[PDB]
Amino acid sequence: TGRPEWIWLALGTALMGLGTLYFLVKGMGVSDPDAKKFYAITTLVPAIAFTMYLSMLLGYGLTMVPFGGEQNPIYWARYADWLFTTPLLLLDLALLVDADQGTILALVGADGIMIGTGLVGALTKVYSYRFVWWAISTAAMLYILYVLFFGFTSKAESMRPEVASTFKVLRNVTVVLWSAYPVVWLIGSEGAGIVPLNIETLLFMVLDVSAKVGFGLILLRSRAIFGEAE
Amino acid sequence: TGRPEWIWLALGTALMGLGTLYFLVKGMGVSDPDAKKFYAITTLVPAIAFTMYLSMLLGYGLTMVPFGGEQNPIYWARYADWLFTTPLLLLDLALLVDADQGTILALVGADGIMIGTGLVGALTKVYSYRFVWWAISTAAMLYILYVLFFGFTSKAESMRPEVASTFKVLRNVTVVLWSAYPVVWLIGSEGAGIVPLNIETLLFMVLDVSAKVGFGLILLRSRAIFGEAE
Amino acid sequence: TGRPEWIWLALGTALMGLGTLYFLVKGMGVSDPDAKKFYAITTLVPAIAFTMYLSMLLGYGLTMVPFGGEQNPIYWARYADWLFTTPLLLLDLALLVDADQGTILALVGADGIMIGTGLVGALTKVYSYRFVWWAISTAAMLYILYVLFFGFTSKAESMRPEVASTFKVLRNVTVVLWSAYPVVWLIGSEGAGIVPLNIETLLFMVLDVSAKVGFGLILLRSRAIFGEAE
Ligand SMILES: CC(C)CCC[C@@H](C)CCC[C@H](C)CCC[C@H](C)CCO[C@H](CO)COCC[C@H](C)CCC[C@@H](C)CCC[C@@H](C)CCCC(C)C
Ligand SMILES: CC(C)CCC[C@@H](C)CCC[C@H](C)CCC[C@H](C)CCO[C@H](CO)COCC[C@H](C)CCC[C@@H](C)CCC[C@@H](C)CCCC(C)C
Ligand SMILES: CC(C)CCC[C@@H](C)CCC[C@H](C)CCC[C@H](C)CCO[C@H](CO)COCC[C@H](C)CCC[C@@H](C)CCC[C@@H](C)CCCC(C)C
Ligand SMILES: *C\C=C(C)/C=C/C=C(C)/C=C/C1=C(C)CCCC1(C)C
Ligand SMILES: *C\C=C(C)/C=C/C=C(C)/C=C/C1=C(C)CCCC1(C)C
Ligand SMILES: *C\C=C(C)/C=C/C=C(C)/C=C/C1=C(C)CCCC1(C)C
Known part of the structure; x- marks a missing residue:
């Protein structure tokens, strides 16, 4: 509790923990192989x-980086998380549209x-160079958002209506929430x-819970995750 | 030789090295694509x-962590090993049952x-918190053991008899040997x-050789690893 | 500019950057799923x-390792690069031959x-042991080169002529350029x-640009990357 951002970290932990347990319980029983992938x-x-x-x-995922004289x-630890969770979120979208x-x-x-x-920028000790990495990371993000809007063209023809409608909502959620991440990092610690830092942590906790648990609720409530079957 | 556990590390090295060479030689010649995967x-x-x-x-994979005042x-390096080897062992089991x-x-x-x-727990400097990570890791292990026993249900119907019998033996080996790992870590260094540490290293060497080389011998001697063919 | 090798790093950066943009532009428009993979x-x-x-x-990817008294x-950072780029180069070859x-x-x-x-050898503080890791890494390389020449046998029968001819050229490029890497490391810093170090960096920059951009130019100009279609 010695760091004012502790409360958002605690709340983040709880909310990710409860979302995990909810989805685990929710997917118990599913047999459809396509749904199994999404769960x-x-x-x-x-x-x-x-x-x-x-x-x-707990303090393990925090480090001190010298830069700007401080x-x-x-x-x-956020980069260790996103290194795996963001390709997984992209895979959910990818699988939806085949x-x-x-x-x-x-x-x-x-x-x-x-x-x-972003990890390299986060750990870079020459203050000005941190923003070069931020720009490159942001360019990679723009590429991803590009592909999510303009790279699934040949798939329109043969997309079930429910799949297309869940994909579009999840794609919109993804584009709005992920785009806030370079902005928060840029203005933050x-x-x-x-x-x-304490407000930065609040922002990241609200975005993360929405993009992960929020995203997952929308997905796992859709019939788009089941193969079409009689 | 300055650390009493050196001998088990040396023996571990040799045994993993000989097992590697044995399996390399054993799989020379195999053409069946399914067998090729398993080799x-x-x-x-x-x-x-x-x-x-x-x-x-050689000392490279050892570090000093302050905790308990010491x-x-x-x-x-064990975590670097298991990070790749344990999903690979699971994949062998997974592929067996399709x-x-x-x-x-x-x-x-x-x-x-x-x-x-487990890696986070191993490197955590607040002694009490090491065991929180141990518990979470152990919960993930219990989940895996759960899935290995109750997650391959729809596959019974269409499982060759030899595949089912090799999978069950390998699954039993897996469940007994992997479960010892949280116990050794918990009572060990x-x-x-x-x-x-020296007895802990002995235990881990005996378990590792069994779960990897021992496991592999059972698998690679089975006909379950070949596609059914005339 | 304080390190004489800066110029080759700068040139490396530029050339990889231009190659990236060229390939991005070149693959805009492609619809063939097989070509899409290769792009x-x-x-x-x-x-x-x-x-x-x-x-x-920028200095982020450089560290000081004590060994030999210095x-x-x-x-x-080279190992962070190759950790992903060399399996990707192998995948291109692998996919070519199915x-x-x-x-x-x-x-x-x-x-x-x-x-x-190689990373372990690069960071090892006991000078003599660095070469043990070099030998093991080199053995893994020889294995890879082995597989690239003698592991795609059953695939000859059913290989389009253009696929076989692009694969052989890319395989030869791969074998000559990758084999120089253990030699440069062994004689270098x-x-x-x-x-x-400055000449070592020059060598690595020339090899890297050739094996990545050079390799990619050959590949992406071939018709071998398209499914056979009317
Ligand atoms: C046992 C486990 C816990 C390990 C599980 C996975 C684990 C290795 C997670 C790692 C995340 C992270 C590095 C945590 C950092 C901790 C620390 C304090 C700092 C690190 O350590 C140091 C400190 O000096 C350096 O890190 C920064 C540089 C990076 C480590 C490497 C950067 C790679 C990229 C910029 C290039 C892009 C790669 C991808 C394109 C790969 C995609 C595959 C594709 C092409 C198919
Ligand atoms: C070039 C190479 C040698 C690299 C090859 C692979 C390599 C990166 C191996 C890494 C293992 C390891 C971190 C070694 C540690 C060394 C060191 C002294 C300590 C580290 O460095 C530091 C020191 O402060 C932090 O490490 C501990 C935290 C971790 C690095 C990250 C933890 C991640 C997890 C707890 C979350 C779970 C991840 C998975 C679910 C991913 C699965 C994918 C899926 C969802 C499909
Ligand atoms: C968020 C991100 C930037 C992370 C993206 C990926 C990232 C983790 C890149 C890591 C590369 C690298 C470790 C960088 C090192 C930085 C540093 C200064 C030193 C490190 O940190 C330390 C310092 O004490 C230790 O590193 C050396 C040991 C290794 C980390 C582990 C070695 C593993 C291997 C020798 C065994 C072989 C593994 C494979 C067979 C896996 C293949 C899968 C298969 C079987 C299917
Ligand atoms: C798991 C929750 C979400 C939405 C994760 C998203 C992570 C990003 C979109 C990160 C973007 C970054 C960029 C584009 C620029 C540098 C700093 C970041 C790594 C934060
Ligand atoms: C390669 C050999 C084997 C069987 C590897 C298994 C590794 C585990 C089962 C590790 C389990 C851990 C748990 C469950 C709790 C924390 C400490 C460990 C990482 C050792
Ligand atoms: C991306 C460009 C290329 C060709 C990368 C290749 C990397 C290798 C072939 C590395 C080989 C090493 C060996 C065999 C011995 C130890 C030192 C290396 C890691 C450099």
Whole structure:
């Protein structure tokens, strides 16, 4: 409790933990192989996020980075989380639309570049260079958002109506929430330092819970996750 | 030789090295694509374990973690090994029974959470919190063991008799040997410190060789790894 | 500019950056799913290499390792690059010949062992032991080259002529360029220290650009990357 951001970390932990348990319970019983894929991916996302929120809460996922003449507290565990959870979120979207394997590789690959360069920016000791990594990461993000809107063209023809409507809602959720992440980082403790760490942590907790648990609720309540069957 | 556990590390290295070479030689010649998968996975497991045993032997895979007021020697390389070898062992089991892809994702994902939280517990400097990570890791392990017993139901109907009988033996080996790992960690150098590092290393070497080389011998001697063919 | 090797790092960065943009532009428009796979993989390789060249250029990807009584500047970011880019290059080759999944696992697995042991050797503080890791890594490399020449036998029968001819050229490029890497490391700053870091960096930049951008140009200009279609 010695760090004012503790409360949001605690709340993040709880909410990811409850979402994990809810999805685990919800997917008990499902037999449809397509649904099984979506439950697995979607349950793992908040399970991973639970562990990394806990790690931040306990202090393990925090480090001090010198830059601007100071020791800046940097929560590195967020990158360990997103390294796995963001390709998993993309896979859910990808599977929904039956994406080509080349498209899934491009998405997962650009996403790893996004998170890996954000991690490098987060740990960089030359203040100005932190923003170069931020720009490159942001370019990888723009690429991903591009592909999510303009890369699933040949799939329109043969998309069930429910699949298309759940994909569009999840795609919109994804595009609005993920785009806030470079902005928060840029104004927050990792960037310009205009928004204090405690508010930054609040923002990230609200975005993370929405993009993971919120996203998963929408998905796992849709019939789009089942094969079409009599 | 300055650390009494050196001998078990040396023996571990040798045994993983010999098992690797045996499996490499044994799979030379195989053409059946299904068998090829099982040889690959099964040869990589002890090859990876060889490198990480060597790293412990040479001192590279050892670190000192402060906790309980002391510098505790923690072999971190075990987590680098298991991070890859335990999903590979699970994949062998998964492929045997033709598991659904959602099931394989759940297994590999829970296994990464098991090893990643064990690594966090192993490196945590607040003694009491080490056991929180141990509990979470152990919960992920229980999940995996659950899935291995109750998640391959729809597959019974259409399982060749030899596949079912090799899977059950390998599943039993897996469940008994993997369950010892949280116990050894808990009583050993990473946990309560009741069993000294040198005996802890002996235990881990005996379990690892059995679960990897022992497991692989059973598997690679079965006809369950070949497609059914005239 | 304080390190004489800066210029090759800068040039490496530029060339990987331009190759990335060229391949991105070149693959815009492609619809053939098989081609899409090859573009994705092949565009990601220099994109990843761009980020890690930049990281070396900026100083983030450099560390000092004590050995031989000295602080040796070791560029660790090369291993972060190759950890992903070399399995991706192998996948391009693998997909060309429609390799069995067991073969792809063996290749990707041996490649991870190659890079992971090279990383361990690069960071090892006992000078003599660095070369043990070099030998093990080199053995994994020889295995890969073996598989690339003698592991795609059953595939000859049913290989389009263009696929076979592009695969052979790319396989030859791969075998000559990758084999230089253990030699450069062995004589360079990570090994015997016979070739200074600045020339070592030049060598690695010339090899990397050739094996990634050079390789990708050959591939992406071939018709072997398209499904056979009327
Ligand atoms: C958020 C992100 C940026 C992360 C993206 C990926 C990322 C984790 C990249 C990592 C590369 C790298 C470790 C960088 C090192 C930085 C540093 C200064 C040093 C590290 O940190 C330390 C310092 O003490 C130890 O590293 C050396 C040991 C290794 C970390 C582990 C070695 C593993 C291998 C030798 C065994 C072989 C593994 C494979 C066979 C796996 C293949 C899968 C298959 C079987 C299917
Ligand atoms: C046993 C376990 C817990 C491990 C489970 C996974 C684990 C390795 C998670 C790692 C996340 C993370 C690095 C945590 C950092 C902790 C620390 C304090 C800092 C690190 O350690 C150091 C400190 O000096 C360096 O890190 C920063 C650089 C990176 C490690 C590497 C960057 C890679 C990228 C920028 C390039 C893009 C890669 C992708 C394109 C890959 C996608 C595959 C595709 C092409 C198919
Ligand atoms: C070039 C190479 C050698 C690299 C090859 C692979 C390599 C990166 C191996 C890494 C293992 C390991 C971290 C070694 C540690 C060395 C060191 C001394 C300590 C580390 O470095 C630091 C020190 O401060 C932090 O580590 C601990 C935290 C972890 C790094 C991250 C934890 C992740 C998890 C707890 C969450 C679960 C993840 C999975 C669910 C992913 C599964 C995918 C799925 C969902 C499909
Ligand atoms: C799991 C929850 C979400 C939505 C995760 C998203 C992570 C990103 C979209 C990260 C983006 C970054 C960019 C684009 C620029 C650098 C800093 C980040 C790594 C935060
Ligand atoms: C390769 C050999 C085997 C059987 C590896 C197994 C590793 C585990 C089952 C690890 C389990 C752990 C748990 C469940 C609790 C924390 C400590 C561990 C990481 C050792
Ligand atoms: C991306 C460009 C290329 C060709 C990368 C290749 C990397 C290798 C072939 C690395 C080999 C190593 C060996 C075999 C021995 C130890 C040192 C290395 C890691 C450099």
